[PDB]
Amino acid sequence: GSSGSSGRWVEGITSEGYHYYYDLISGASQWEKPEGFQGDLKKTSGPSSG
């Protein structure tokens, strides 16, 4: 509509193997965990792997 509601981040990995969170909104990045990130459930489960 006007602006994007709720936060949009995804947990991945960086150099070496550090679990970081990226931003799809525009394309931001941060080490720390974003506000109400909530992104980690059923790790490697079901049909969709990884």
From Swiss-Prot:
Q: Domain WW spans what residues?
A: 8-36
State the superkingdom.
Eukaryota
Where can this protein be found? Nucleus; Nucleus speckle
Query: Subunit structure, briefly?
Result: Component of the spliceosome B complex. Associated with U2 snRNPs. Binds splicing factors SNRPB, SNRPC and SF1. Interacts via the WW domains with the Pro-rich domains of KHDRBS1/SAM68. Interacts via the WW domains with the Pro-rich domains of WBP11. Interacts with SNRNP200.
Report the function annotation for this chain: Involved in pre-mRNA splicing as a component of the spliceosome. May play a role in cross-intron bridging of U1 and U2 snRNPs in the mammalian A complex.
The disease this record links to the protein is: Neurodevelopmental disorder with hypotonia, feeding difficulties, facial dysmorphism, and brain abnormalities: An autosomal recessive, severe disorder apparent from infancy and characterized by global developmental delay, poor or absent speech, severe intellectual disability, hypotonia, and musculoskeletal and gastrointestinal abnormalities. Brain imaging shows aplasia or hypoplasia of corpus callosum in most patients.
Q: What is known of its domains?
A: The WW domain recognizes the proline, glycine and methionine-rich (PGM) motif present in the splicing factors, as well as the Arg/Gly-rich-flanked Pro-rich domains found in several WW domain-binding proteins.
Its name, as the record gives it, is WW domain-binding protein 4
Q: From which organism does this entry originate?
A: Homo sapiens
Shown segment, full-protein numbering: 127 to 163 of 376
